[PDB]
Design a protein around this ligand. Sequence first.
Ligand SMILES: CC(=O)N[C@H]1[C@H]([C@H](O)[C@H](O)CO)O[C@@](O)(C(=O)O)C[C@@H]1O
Ligand SMILES: CC(=O)N[C@H]1[C@H]([C@H](O)[C@H](O)CO)O[C@@](O)(C(=O)O)C[C@@H]1O
Ligand SMILES: CC(=O)N[C@H]1[C@H]([C@H](O)[C@H](O)CO)O[C@@](O)(C(=O)O)C[C@@H]1O
Ligand SMILES: CC(=O)N[C@H]1[C@H]([C@H](O)[C@H](O)CO)O[C@@](O)(C(=O)O)C[C@@H]1O
Ligand SMILES: [Cl-]
Ligand SMILES: [Cl-]
Ligand SMILES: [Cl-]
Ligand SMILES: [Cl-]
Ligand SMILES: [Cl-]
Ligand SMILES: [Cl-]
Ligand SMILES: [Mg+2]
Lengths: 260, 267, 261, 267, 263
Amino acid sequence: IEVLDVKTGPDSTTTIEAYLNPRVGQNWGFSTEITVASNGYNDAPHLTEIPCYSSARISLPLLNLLMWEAVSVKTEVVGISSMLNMHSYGLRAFGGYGGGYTIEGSHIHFFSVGGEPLDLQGLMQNHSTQYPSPLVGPKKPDGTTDDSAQVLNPIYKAKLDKDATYPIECWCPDPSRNENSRYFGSYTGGVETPPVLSFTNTSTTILLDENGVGPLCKGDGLYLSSADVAGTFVQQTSQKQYWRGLPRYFNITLRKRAVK
Amino acid sequence: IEVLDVKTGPDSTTTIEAYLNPRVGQNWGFSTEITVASNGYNDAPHLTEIPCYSSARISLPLLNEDITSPTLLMWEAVSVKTEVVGISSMLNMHSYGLRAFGGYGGGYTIEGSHIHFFSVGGEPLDLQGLMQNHSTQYPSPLVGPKKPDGTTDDSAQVLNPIYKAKLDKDATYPIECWCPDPSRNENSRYFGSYTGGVETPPVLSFTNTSTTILLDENGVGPLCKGDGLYLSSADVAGTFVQQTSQKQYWRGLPRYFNITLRKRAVK
Amino acid sequence: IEVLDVKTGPDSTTTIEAYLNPRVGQNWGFSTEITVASNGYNDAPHLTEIPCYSSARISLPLLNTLLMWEAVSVKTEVVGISSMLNMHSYGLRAFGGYGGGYTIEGSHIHFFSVGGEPLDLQGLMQNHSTQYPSPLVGPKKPDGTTDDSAQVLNPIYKAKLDKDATYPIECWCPDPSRNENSRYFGSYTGGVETPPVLSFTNTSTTILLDENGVGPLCKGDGLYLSSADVAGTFVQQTSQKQYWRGLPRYFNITLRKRAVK
Amino acid sequence: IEVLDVKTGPDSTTTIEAYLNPRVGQNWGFSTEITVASNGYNDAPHLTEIPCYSSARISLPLLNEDITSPTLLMWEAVSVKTEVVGISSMLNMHSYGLRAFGGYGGGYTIEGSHIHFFSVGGEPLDLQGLMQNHSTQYPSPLVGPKKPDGTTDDSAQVLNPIYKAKLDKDATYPIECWCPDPSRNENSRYFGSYTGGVETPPVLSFTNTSTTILLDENGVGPLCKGDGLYLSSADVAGTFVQQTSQKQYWRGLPRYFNITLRKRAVK
Amino acid sequence: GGIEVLDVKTGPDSTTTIEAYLNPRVGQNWGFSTEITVASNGYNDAPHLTEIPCYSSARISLPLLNLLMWEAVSVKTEVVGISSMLNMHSYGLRAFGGYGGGYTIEGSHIHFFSVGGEPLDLQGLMQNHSTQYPSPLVGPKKPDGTTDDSAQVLNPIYKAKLDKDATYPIECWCPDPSRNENSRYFGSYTGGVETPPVLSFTNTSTTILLDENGVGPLCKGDGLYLSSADVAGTFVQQTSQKQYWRGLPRYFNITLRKRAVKN
Ligand SMILES: CC(=O)N[C@H]1[C@H]([C@H](O)[C@H](O)CO)O[C@@](O)(C(=O)O)C[C@@H]1O
Ligand SMILES: CC(=O)N[C@H]1[C@H]([C@H](O)[C@H](O)CO)O[C@@](O)(C(=O)O)C[C@@H]1O
Ligand SMILES: CC(=O)N[C@H]1[C@H]([C@H](O)[C@H](O)CO)O[C@@](O)(C(=O)O)C[C@@H]1O
Ligand SMILES: CC(=O)N[C@H]1[C@H]([C@H](O)[C@H](O)CO)O[C@@](O)(C(=O)O)C[C@@H]1O
Ligand SMILES: [Cl-]
Ligand SMILES: [Cl-]
Ligand SMILES: [Cl-]
Ligand SMILES: [Cl-]
Ligand SMILES: [Cl-]
Ligand SMILES: [Cl-]
Ligand SMILES: [Mg+2]
């Protein structure tokens, strides 16, 4: 798009409220138990134990030479306070006499705002991982997945076009594309790593680029994406781990922009 | 409310000092022992083991005293100096703490998962329901996320708009099933940080030189409806781990507020 | 005090160098062994195992509209941080006893205040029933009692930091409802084996002027310094006993003459 | 080179996209098992267990000397957008990792000592020799710090100027015996962070909103000699710990570059 | 210093740069101490010369000027060979019950540098007043030759000038904040048993050495005084489970300019 003047005047700005609920393998914020393939056997995790990118397309007011331009977003991880819970069946500290473990371990927090689906690059820890249908993993055109999927091979790309479909563990945001999307992510590893999350209604993220242009919403659609895996729940007795996801709130400010 | 000019002149600004004491299940800064339901049994924690949001409504000086005035005035919260009081209380290795280095060392200082949170507003803080276990049984008089029919389904573990409340009572709304609602609270400013982990060390700073500005993108602060300033607090520093019993108790700290307000005109 | 113009000209500014040595229960940077009361028995720690606020009043040049010294800025440093790079002085030994001694570790607090009067203290303690030996001073009501409310905020429990080595860190914090004429700065870190992180440079400066460009005004021509620098605990091999370790704080205050009504 | 005016006008700026895949001893993001010499035996690690600097020379558009102009033109690297690709790949607790909570929990995510480093330059990055063990035996075709006589003495464990190299070959210079030479690299900008520890969690961020400025104290960027832009990378995220074997493997990640260059005149 | 400072001479040959490196002095000269030893409770604390890390220090000769003094304006400094620590094969204590790789350098660490126009002023403070430092090391002594309990806190009687490389132990001397008017110093210490070192390296950082009044260190006797203390942590050896201090070299690049002075 050749970008022109910013239309100002009445009915020239609008806000969009939306939330994305987490897709950690089931719909209620927890995966099924995390399983580990035995050395030499297939790496074939259960559908319901594999966290995926949350994604939605919000319909914007119809315009027509004008496109909605995303200027800023207020975003928050909802239900952080839910984790201050040491009674709900957690593995017990101090030889079983203390309280249950709060959510801990490896976690990722990520959001994107765009005028089109987020561009994904294929990269995974184990090229041989078997993702059950209907999940989508990095495949060559011939249907195979070789060792190169553990590093950067441009052959492995996708568009984040379906909720609860693209596993976090084999797709990252493609930095060679996403010209019309703004994305932000932080991953922390470790076995018992404590989650650190902040929440305030005073933060704002500017979405304008080096040249003061925001994401331009093609087909009058605003594209939100989320991945908020706070860590794992560790259950007493079973000592099994479950991925715990949290919902993300969005508040996008858009304005009318003219295009050639 | 259509916001107008900021009235300046004498008696046009005022300060409010307040403190909120913590409500961690009892009134003296400690919960009763944290209990854990056995797998397959009801998750039914004791009233006195469940930390709640502290909350108060401070009465502000009367405004629309002048029966001739052409414009209504509301107090506008501009800035707050806030401090977590008694942080230094935690430098204590003699008061019955689980003992380090095979029992020959000093007692454990407060450690583990902690949350620190405050809000200033012109009305009660808007809460969204979200909890780790939808089936948790909160004893009366605590209030948890319920649908209109009285039930609580699996959706309460993620975002379902059906689960909302106003933080209208002290020591009543559990921290673990209510968070600030980011879809509302237009007339409140809230700030929170949570840290998880089993033995995580609390890190807290204290100074009388910090100030938090409460004005929004458009230079408007919280406007105090009914001449009431609404303070909220949640300062669970971590857990006390007791020697011998090896039981854990939530430890809360009080929060000090110093709000600067000014008169603002409204249509 | 109604504050007026800042007197400028010769002999209108001065600097004060001072150090506060730590008061961790003895005078040489270590407490006696930390003891823990048995559940159900009195919580009665030894005088020499309880760290206290360090405090001094520096005498300023006599001045006498009246003039008061105004504290503008302070360069401050925690002295002897490098002293902790020591793995040979009797520390509990790592890697099954074959490695070096534990460096100072565990819960620590670092705090300083500059003021024109004694620092205002608020009473708050972990255990209301703690018995502080004389001559230490703990939160008492006027009647001499100490109730459960001392574990949260009760305004009845206040004091002025008017004596060195007297006010325990564990039952007194800076009172944020007062200290209009003091500037205080403090950071506490908990944990059992938490590593201390301390920096030192002669390039840092802390401005002491308030929202209205007024610094602490030194009443009775006295500058009031306060310190609490408990770097952590020393863990001794064999005994596996813990001792509080304190460090001294250096102050360099710049003051200027200010007029008052 | 005497640096002159910045040529502006049409065809005077250009961008370069590139990626460097990691060289951790094999080409698919993992080393072979990390081995440890027995005390008193040779320190002789396998070729395929030794991570190396990734490196490439990107060809820039040829800049043709104008016999009427008084001044030659060189490409000047102004800014770089760079990202560590496939960070999200590490949120994997099913792919054969050593299992937590006595073997009943999920596999360990990548953890332990890690280094993240990138350089942009108008020539090969200048390397200084420094290694933990001077006696380490690097198999051919790797290149380690050698004196002219072929030996490597104790001084290679500190700074000896005799041990220098140019990062002129991919997958060749081990990270563990070469660092960026701060006494040179006038025409390169380099950025690195190392974290030690046994089980240290990696912390990595990713966004398409970050930019690193490459201009120096005097507003001059790397000047690309022979119309070549020199990229270097070292992104060892940590180790994979395998269940049962309890063997460790270095895990590398690819780095994306997006360099903005402009024409600069030189005497 | 006690020099009255005047105008900054500008013009040709009025600025110069100095490149230098200080190699670490952790008790031997090749980046490692001998094994760390621990006195038994009740016995003398008498560590080996070669197990005690010391401040690195050098005096660089500047071009002769004559009044004019060289003024240190800025320094680019870097800890060299950080990447050397990404080594899990060189005899380190082995992780995951001995089946994993060797421990990288870990534990308590200090990183420190100073630039000055004279030797760095040191204050005596030590963890154990009774520590016995072998000759030729220099520890805090009173004039009478003794060292009392006061050396564990601040006693002004215990001072020294960092006038010799590999001589002043880090563990009993810190920079004296009551002096060093003509030096700029910067240090960070981290404790703990297994604490991971975190070090960054870039040729884009610069540290300004000018004070509150835009005056840098003035190099007395046409000498620039560099000091370093970079103990990255300890090496933990498999089988022996003994610990060795590991030091790293520091690179300096100082920019100086001519400054005029009275008297
Ligand atoms: C990643 C993976 O391959 N998971 C597999 C698990 C793991 O072996 C468990 O960890 C056993 O504890 O076992 C299965 O039999 C199962 O539970 O259905 C098959 C499944 O494909
Ligand atoms: C969270 C919860 O449900 N707590 C329950 C506990 C836990 O199961 C104990 O930790 C093990 O008995 O048990 C009770 O008998 C109790 O102690 O009062 C009932 C209570 O409902
Ligand atoms: C660094 C080093 O010298 N490693 C040597 C190792 C290790 O001692 C063991 O693998 C212990 O893990 O032993 C070898 O037989 C091997 O595996 O190839 C030879 C190799 O040269
Ligand atoms: C700091 C110190 O005083 N170290 C002493 C050590 C340690 O006690 C042992 O290495 C640990 O048992 O013992 C010595 O015999 C030695 O190693 O030469 C004398 C030495 O003076
Ligand atoms: Cl939605
Ligand atoms: Cl009050
Ligand atoms: Cl208790
Ligand atoms: Cl906060
Ligand atoms: Cl501080
Ligand atoms: Cl593998
Ligand atoms: Mg009336």
